[PDB]
Amino acid sequence: YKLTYYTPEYETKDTDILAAFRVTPQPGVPPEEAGAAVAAESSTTVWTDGLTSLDRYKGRCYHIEPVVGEDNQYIAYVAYPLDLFEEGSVTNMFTSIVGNVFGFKALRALRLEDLRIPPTYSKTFQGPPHGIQVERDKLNKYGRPLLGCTIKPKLGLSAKNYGRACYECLRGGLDFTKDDENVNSQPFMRWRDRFVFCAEAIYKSQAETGEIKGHYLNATAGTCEEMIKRAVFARELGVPIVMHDYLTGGFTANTSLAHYCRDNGLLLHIHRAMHAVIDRQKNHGMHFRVLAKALRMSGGDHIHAGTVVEREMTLGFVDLLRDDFIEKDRARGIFFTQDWVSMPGVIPVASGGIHVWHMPALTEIFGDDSVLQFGGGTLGHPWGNAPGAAANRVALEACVQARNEGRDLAREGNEIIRSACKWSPELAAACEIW
Amino acid sequence: KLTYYTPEYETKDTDILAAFRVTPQPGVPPEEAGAAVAAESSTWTDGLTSLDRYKGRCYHIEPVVGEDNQYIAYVAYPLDLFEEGSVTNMFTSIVGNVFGFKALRALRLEDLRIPPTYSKTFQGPPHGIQVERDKLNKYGRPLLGCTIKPKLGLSAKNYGRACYECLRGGLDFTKDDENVNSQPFMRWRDRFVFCAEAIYKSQAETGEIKGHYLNATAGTCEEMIKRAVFARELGVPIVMHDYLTGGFTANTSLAHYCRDNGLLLHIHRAMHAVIDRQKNHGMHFRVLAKALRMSGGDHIHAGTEREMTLGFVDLLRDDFIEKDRARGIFFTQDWVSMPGVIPVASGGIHVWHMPALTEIFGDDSVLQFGGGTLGHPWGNAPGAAANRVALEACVQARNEGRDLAREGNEIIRSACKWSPELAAACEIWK
Amino acid sequence: YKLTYYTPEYETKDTDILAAFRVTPQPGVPPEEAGAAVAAESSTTVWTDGLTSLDRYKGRCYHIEPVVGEDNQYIAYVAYPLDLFEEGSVTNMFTSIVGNVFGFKALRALRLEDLRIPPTYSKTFQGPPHGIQVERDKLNKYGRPLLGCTIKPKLGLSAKNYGRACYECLRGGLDFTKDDENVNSQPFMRWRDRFVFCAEAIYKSQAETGEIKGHYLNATAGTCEEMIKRAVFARELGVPIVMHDYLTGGFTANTSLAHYCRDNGLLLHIHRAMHAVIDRQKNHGMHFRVLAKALRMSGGDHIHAGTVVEREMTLGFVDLLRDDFIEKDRARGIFFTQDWVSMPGVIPVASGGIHVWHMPALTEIFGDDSVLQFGGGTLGHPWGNAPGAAANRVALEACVQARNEGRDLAREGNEIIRSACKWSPELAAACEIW
Amino acid sequence: DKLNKYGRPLLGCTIKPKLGLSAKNYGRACYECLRGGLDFTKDDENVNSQPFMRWRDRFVFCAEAIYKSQAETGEIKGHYLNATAGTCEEMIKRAVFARELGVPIVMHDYLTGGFTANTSLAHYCRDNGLLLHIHRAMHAVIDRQKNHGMHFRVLAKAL
Amino acid sequence: MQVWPIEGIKKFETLSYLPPLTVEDLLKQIEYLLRSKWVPCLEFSKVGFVYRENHRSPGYYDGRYWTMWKLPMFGCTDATQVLKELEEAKKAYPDAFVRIIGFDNVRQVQCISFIAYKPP
Numbered sequence A, C: 001y002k003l004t005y006y007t008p009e010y011e012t013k014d015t016d017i018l019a020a021f022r023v024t025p026q027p028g029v030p031p032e033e034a035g036a037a038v039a040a041e042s043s044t045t046v047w048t049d050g051l052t053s054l055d056r057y058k059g060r061c062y063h064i065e066p067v068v069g070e071d072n073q074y075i076a077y078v079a080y081p082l083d084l085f086e087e088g089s090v091t092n093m094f095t096s097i098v099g100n101v102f103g104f105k106a107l108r109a110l111r112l113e114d115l116r117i118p119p120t121y122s123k124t125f126q127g128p129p130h131g132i133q134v135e136r137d138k139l140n141k142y143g144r145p146l147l148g149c150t151i152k153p154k155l156g157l158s159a160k161n162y163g164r165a166c167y168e169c170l171r172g173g174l175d176f177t178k179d180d181e182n183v184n185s186q187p188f189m190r191w192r193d194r195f196v197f198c199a200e201a202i203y204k205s206q207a208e209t210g211e212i213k214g215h216y217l218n219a220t221a222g223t224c225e226e227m228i229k230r231a232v233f234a235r236e237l238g239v240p241i242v243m244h245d246y247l248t249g250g251f252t253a254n255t256s257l258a259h260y261c262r263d264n265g266l267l268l269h270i271h272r273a274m275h276a277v278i279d280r281q282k283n284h285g286m287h288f289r290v291l292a293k294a295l296r297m298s299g300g301d302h303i304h305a306g307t308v309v310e311r312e313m314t315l316g317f318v319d320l321l322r323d324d325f326i327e328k329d330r331a332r333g334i335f336f337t338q339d340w341v342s343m344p345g346v347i348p349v350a351s352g353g354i355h356v357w358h359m360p361a362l363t364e365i366f367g368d369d370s371v372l373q374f375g376g377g378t379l380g381h382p383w384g385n386a387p388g389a390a391a392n393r394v395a396l397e398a399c400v401q402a403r404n405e406g407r408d409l410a411r412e413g414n415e416i417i418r419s420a421c422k423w424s425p426e427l428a429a430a431c432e433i434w
Numbered sequence B: 001k002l003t004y005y006t007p008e009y010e011t012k013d014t015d016i017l018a019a020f021r022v023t024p025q026p027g028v029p030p031e032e033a034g035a036a037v038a039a040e041s042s043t044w045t046d047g048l049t050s051l052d053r054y055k056g057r058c059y060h061i062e063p064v065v066g067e068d069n070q071y072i073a074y075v076a077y078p079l080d081l082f083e084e085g086s087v088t089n090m091f092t093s094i095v096g097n098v099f100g101f102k103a104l105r106a107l108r109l110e111d112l113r114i115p116p117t118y119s120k121t122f123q124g125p126p127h128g129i130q131v132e133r134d135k136l137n138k139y140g141r142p143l144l145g146c147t148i149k150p151k152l153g154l155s156a157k158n159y160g161r162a163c164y165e166c167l168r169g170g171l172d173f174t175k176d177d178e179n180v181n182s183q184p185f186m187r188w189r190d191r192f193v194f195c196a197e198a199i200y201k202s203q204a205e206t207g208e209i210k211g212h213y214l215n216a217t218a219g220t221c222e223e224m225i226k227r228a229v230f231a232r233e234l235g236v237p238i239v240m241h242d243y244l245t246g247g248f249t250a251n252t253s254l255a256h257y258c259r260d261n262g263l264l265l266h267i268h269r270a271m272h273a274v275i276d277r278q279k280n281h282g283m284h285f286r287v288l289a290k291a292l293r294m295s296g297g298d299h300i301h302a303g304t305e306r307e308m309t310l311g312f313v314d315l316l317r318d319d320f321i322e323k324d325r326a327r328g329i330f331f332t333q334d335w336v337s338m339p340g341v342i343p344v345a346s347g348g349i350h351v352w353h354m355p356a357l358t359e360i361f362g363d364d365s366v367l368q369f370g371g372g373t374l375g376h377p378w379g380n381a382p383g384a385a386a387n388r389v390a391l392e393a394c395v396q397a398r399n400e401g402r403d404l405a406r407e408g409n410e411i412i413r414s415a416c417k418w419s420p421e422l423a424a425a426c427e428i429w430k
Numbered sequence D: 001d002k003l004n005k006y007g008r009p010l011l012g013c014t015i016k017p018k019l020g021l022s023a024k025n026y027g028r029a030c031y032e033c034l035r036g037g038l039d040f041t042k043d044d045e046n047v048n049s050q051p052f053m054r055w056r057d058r059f060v061f062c063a064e065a066i067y068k069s070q071a072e073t074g075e076i077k078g079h080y081l082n083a084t085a086g087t088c089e090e091m092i093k094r095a096v097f098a099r100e101l102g103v104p105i106v107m108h109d110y111l112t113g114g115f116t117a118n119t120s121l122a123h124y125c126r127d128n129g130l131l132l133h134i135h136r137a138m139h140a141v142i143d144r145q146k147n148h149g150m151h152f153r154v155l156a157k158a159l
Numbered sequence E: 001m002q003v004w005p006i007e008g009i010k011k012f013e014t015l016s017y018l019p020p021l022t023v024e025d026l027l028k029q030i031e032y033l034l035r036s037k038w039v040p041c042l043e044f045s046k047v048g049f050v051y052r053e054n055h056r057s058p059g060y061y062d063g064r065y066w067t068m069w070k071l072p073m074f075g076c077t078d079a080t081q082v083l084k085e086l087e088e089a090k091k092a093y094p095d096a097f098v099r100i101i102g103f104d105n106v107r108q109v110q111c112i113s114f115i116a117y118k119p120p
């Protein structure tokens, strides 16, 4: 029934989990009907229904409106009761909300845009093993975005040659180096060997520079036993941070890892491999912000957030990832006011074709609480990894200094970089190739 | 007042609220006393944070009708001050320091508003009222139990013998006295063994599921769990713990073990009167009751004034309880589906009290008869039968529409006509 | 029956546990009757009574006398047989003695004032993990009260900023810093992070001063599994002392922690949060001395004992906590001669609005075997924590030196402090604000 | 070979007084004796764990003494830490902590503790590289009289 | 506002926060021990502070024990006798720290320890 499930006068409860769906009904399906279907098919005739009160377990579409997106498209708001969800289980939340409704015939397409996670539910999750503040304090780093570099080539390098690249990058000024998402354990490089050599690299660069260093050691594995075995050895090595591909590994496994990291003081870097399979298309799937909120709940200290070179949408989920209270702002993809009631924030990681000239914009857009992850941006420096890292570290600090003085990074970006090239041969050499 | 007295503060849905009955010292204005209660129970280094964000605050003060120099001060504590899932920390944070403040002659915590956001961080009852009824397959009547007497002095075997006779006669449970843990005269493992034989012997005989609250209360957490573990091995349905003397940290661990192993948990409130007796100082039982529901328990002794009891009984059993000063409910309490706890009535009760007990508590309760069973002139089985008959006679009468409050005695007298067991009991307990 | 339970000619056995109750009978209840009721209701007609000998399990009131306290008040002495109690269980002792009698209708009010713990029962308890002597030897500290400071503000500080305060206080001269009783693990500061930073602070201050330092790391938790998990990490960090709120956490949990500390060489600082709920009123409850004896039995190396600015009552339970043999002295709240048969003593901790000017009195009243815990007394120093700690350490030693020379601290206190201000700018600055 | 000592009888001293000394004062005596030239110091047979001196505290202070004297003299030192206990669980618990401390030798009163327990301890010491000093407390109860009992040589072969 | 020094003011527990004691003040502390019926004893070391080299488990520290100067002065009734030993120690080991400790046969324990000399 449209009005069993379509309740336009329903007032959401502070304990409801709310969802904003972008719905594309099939021809001949009224919006009210589509909305009701979305709610009904993602929630609740058989005699057993008489042994309880279905009304207290049904999801309900309390609002639907034509959207400006495209052809016969609408945003439907659905409210789900708190009791439907298993405490601390992102897996069950996803299963309950997006487990079945996307295949409904009456819908040509469907995409989950946002979720309002009430305090009564979020409080049942540990959340980030540490969070932005704790991480800065643990690593003793303040006043600037963090810097990192992904080791290349992806596969093919020996564990030792891999560590060599790590050391050179780190000693040059980067805070972190990182295992590619595909690097777990393979014939050309078994994981334990990589952990050993990367540990030597981490400590060599730290002793040389005097600054705390780290390398996101990928613990992503085929099984939970293997995943933990890798985290355990990193723990033995005393390194500060490990890594996991939460989507390919899965939420059940990620949550377990997040708990291990909390119990052992390990920072957890989260890569979002395979997200585009789900969040690329505007008409169907789940927008990344939903996957981002899910990660903050399941647990992660860093999370890849994409590149900056749409901006407003990125800034939108960045706030959803770092802030305690985010006000409704559909212009930035925020369909619901979100209150995290003190759950720690996650540091967003920007990566993808970024180089020294992008430093002003990146610093400007993300602010200090971010990680700027380079690739060839550092490994492609004509003088090698150490000079490349130095060029990026110098470029970044030049931007920070200028911003702190009140200069406009968005307008004076190029001059700030050009000016820094005067006293930094490394930066100058980088600005000549890019 | 101070930074602490904010009479127009609008409480947040995540705040933990407290209602304190404060008795100021001579010369201490109610406003100052209230602010003090809030300040003393909460808050150059202050410059590294926000004191307002972590301060407890008295948002309302009112006098106590009919009382001299007594007021109710309401205080709101931010959610961030409390460790999730820890009743121990909630008690430490709210009542850990303020009761000794010199500016106050006396202080009593009357109620606590537990916000859903905080209660959702607690497992709560291992099973709860509904699950227990389905597990034991018992419906439509208060449950019946008996505490084995004499308290101490019996051998493990003689103890079990009494268990068997009580259970075979119609009682659902028999129990270890709160002081019965493990002692020279009767070590716990021996008692568990014989009580287990008794439980199964009576169950096979009657056809109804039986249980004996095996006390796991101990000196250390290691001993407590060891006892629960053997009860688990024995396959029995229920164990017990004295949550106040054992403590919340221990009780919570036991509640978790019970949930993980399908064991019902009977909670005794030994020592509660040391804290909840006096109206001027301490903590009202309803606070200790909410604390137990949060920490974890399937049963909890609630005693045998009337309106106040009905008040915390609802707080223990229901999902949503609206504020009601007449019943001592200072705050509307929403448990957001956390299971309820079965209240246990005990203390000098016998067959003639069945009508009133049934009428006041209703079906979801346990009526515990000590001497009211063991005192029967014909023994434990006949004594249990008399109580079971008396109770069912009341249930039948109530179900037919009769007024237990006005026809109680007449209902019992009629039952004595066909129940020789009940007749004998009534002759002794008048 | 009055004379089944009221036995005025009964001679106590060396194995009985004796209790002194302050009883306030309801109007119309004779003292003999009240006393008998107290004994009967806190101990032992049904046919089963014939299967044993109730006389050997009944508690008995062997003496009752009108007390000078107030209106119709009496002190009733009750004797309980050794066999009623489970060995090594403070929980069972409390349950057996104060578990039921306080709610008896015939009594308007009731308060347990003291308990005579026979050697046959106390010998079944481990007691303090270490005790006064062992602690002094372990920390290599002799001839003076120990000094500590509770970190403020209570809540709101980050784990790192918290550790910063620890280090500054410790490096200035204090032996310990401490977690507030409310500080366990919360959104603003998770426990493991606090342990990490406080450990860095402990070792930094120790290396700088050359004196052994410590910080009472609070292990109080919601469950025994969490409580032990915290003790275990402190053990890994190799720090000397942890902390527990024995009353809010409970005796079953405290005893387990005390055993862990003994098995792992950890000192155990005990906070008495919530004690005033029970021991404030003279007419009803349990006097702190009972809670103190209980802690010594369950296990603790330090225990908060209140402030000194009634004195005789405080001194009374201080002896009950530290000495091996304490003679009956009702003027100091000691209703029974207490013999601990070599169970180690517990160091009493004085805290609460104390500052430099109170040093003479505190040293005088408590003697060397105590811990003087400051708050703003050190954190409120105009020059900061380190100078504040130095002022307190100087003030204390000045008092010790003067006392050792035979001077009267009670009469020459102010002069001793004023004299020390001459060579200690830090102390001078402290004496100007307080 | 383990202690790098050759060409002479080894030397040791039993700490006195037997009972009454604090764990620290006990260790103090250990250090002074060892630094003077003795290879070992030792817990009296009666010294296990008591009110005046609990075992773990003694192990801690004697370990400090062992290492202080060794660093000062340059020669390997040891102290027979008595693991004799009321139960096998306690006996092993003491051996385990000595193992953690990295000291070279522990001690057991094989006759009062018993052969079943001694054999278990001997196995633990082998598995963990600990030397085992054996005291023969109570032997005279059995081997004193020529007419009845068991001569010590039998008790010796047994050990 | 003065900043508490980070170096040069290492400590030796009780009394080390007071200015250097004079011979008279030192005598008074010794007399305190004698009047209290405690046995004075001197200890010396070239290393004056605690450290952790052999273990880092709870309660374990190196550098707590120092070396005994001769033996505890049992039956001492003249404080100046202690001063004499202190002077001999200083002469034999001028580059060593020397502290005075006290023992009680009643409490059966060490109950005193204060620095008496520090090398230049």
Ligand SMILES: NC(=O)C1=CN([C@@H]2O[C@H](COP(=O)(O)OP(=O)(O)OC[C@H]3O[C@@H](n4cnc5c(N)ncnc54)[C@H](OP(=O)(O)O)[C@@H]3O)[C@@H](O)[C@H]2O)C=CC1
Binding pocket: A150, A272, A273, A276, A304, A305, A306, A307, A351, A352, A353, A354, A355, A373, A374, A375, A376, A377, A378, A380
């Ligand atoms: N010397 C040469 O030959 C040159 C080399 N390069 C340079 O080499 C460097 C390579 O590193 P960089 O690109 O920074 O980072 P990486 O290659 O390490 O990629 C990091 C992230 O970029 C995103 N990404 C990159 N490739 C794609 C793709 N095919 N489709 C979707 N997303 C993509 C992904 O983001 P997410 O996980 O968020 O989806 C990925 O996680 C750059 O500086 C590039 O300009 C290019 C030109 C010249």
Ligand SMILES: NC(=O)C1=CN([C@@H]2O[C@H](COP(=O)(O)OP(=O)(O)OC[C@H]3O[C@@H](n4cnc5c(N)ncnc54)[C@H](OP(=O)(O)O)[C@@H]3O)[C@@H](O)[C@H]2O)C=CC1
Binding pocket: B040, B097, B098, B099, B100, B101, B102, C150, C272, C273, C276, C304, C305, C306, C307, C351, C352, C353, C354, C355, C373, C374, C375, C376, C377, C378, C380
């Ligand atoms: N700068 C400023 O604004 C000023 C600050 N303050 C100062 O700040 C410092 C705070 O530290 P301090 O008071 O020493 O110790 P804490 O606040 O750390 O308290 C330690 C103990 O004092 C007792 N206590 C304190 N408050 C109360 C209360 N409300 N009711 C009952 N008992 C209480 C409790 O003892 P137990 O656990 O034994 O019951 C508590 O455990 C003091 O020196 C105080 O004078 C005050 C005036 C000025």
Ligand SMILES: NC(=O)C1=CN([C@@H]2O[C@H](COP(=O)(O)OP(=O)(O)OC[C@H]3O[C@@H](n4cnc5c(N)ncnc54)[C@H](OP(=O)(O)O)[C@@H]3O)[C@@H](O)[C@H]2O)C=CC1
Binding pocket: B147, B269, B270, B273, B301, B302, B303, B304, B346, B347, B348, B349, B350, B368, B369, B370, B371, B372, B375, C041, C045, C046, C100, C101, C102, C103, C104, C105
């Ligand atoms: N044959 C005879 O000699 C007779 C025997 N008795 C009878 O024997 C039976 C004894 O069992 P019953 O009393 O039912 O229950 P129990 O003795 O098993 O007590 C159960 C609860 O009653 C409360 N209680 C009982 N005594 C007191 C006390 N002294 N002060 C405070 N609270 C008290 C406590 O409640 P909480 O834990 O909630 O505080 C206790 O947990 C009764 O039926 C009684 O009438 C009495 C007269 C005659």
Ligand SMILES: [Mg+2]
Binding pocket: A150, A179, A180, A181, A182
């Ligand atoms: Mg990659």
Ligand SMILES: [Mg+2]
Binding pocket: B147, B177, B178, B179
């Ligand atoms: Mg009972």
Ligand SMILES: [Mg+2]
Binding pocket: C150, C179, C180, C181, C182
């Ligand atoms: Mg405090």
Ligand SMILES: [Mg+2]
Binding pocket: D014, D043, D044, D045, D046
């Ligand atoms: Mg010997």
